[PDB]
């Protein structure tokens, strides 16, 4: 393992919303495969449903278009079709209390999923450890 195990409690029973303190956005897929933040509680776009394939390891699902979450190889989030080796994060506690995501892929290098201050998200050198970018709390849709 490059990484810890402390897991976070809640399950993928229902959909949810990953909210980022850093800048206060919540993460969205768009139908093009773009992927940003956005304050609008109201964005048909947020709303996502997440699912265990190994305990710990998730798949990060838009419920209105079935695209999967995904970092390239360059670091870029994006709205992928169809599963695949890119689109598996590893899902832990952070601070006792936020969930952040790790690209398993990418996970010796420690790539997370995040959003900066103005609500982009950040390629995967860009974080790291510690940030408040990388900070989220799953939210009741």
């Not at 969205?28 to 048909?44: A, C, E, F, N, W």
């Not at 936020?98 to 201050?117: C, M, R």
Request: with cysteine; charged share 20%; glycine share 10%.
């Amino acid at each position: 393992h490059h990484h810890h195990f402390n897991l976070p409690p809640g399950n993928y029973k229902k959909p949810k919303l990953l909210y980022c303190s850093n800048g206060g956005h919540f993460l969205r897929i768009l139908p093009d495969g773009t992927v940003d933040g956005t304050r609008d509680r109201s964005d048909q776009h947020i709303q996502l449903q997440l699912s265990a394939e190994s305990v710990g390891e998730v798949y990060i699902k838009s419920t209105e278009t079935g695209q999967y979450l995904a970092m390239d190889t360059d670091g870029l989030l994006y709205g992928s079709q169809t599963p695949n080796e890119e689109c598996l994060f590893l899902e832990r506690l952070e601070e006792n209390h936020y969930n952040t995501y790790i690209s398993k892929k990418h996970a010796e290098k420690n790539w997370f999923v995040g959003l900066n201050k103005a609500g982009s998200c950040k390629r995967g050198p860009r974080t790291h450890y510690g940030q408040k970018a990388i900070l989220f709390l799953p939210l009741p849709v």
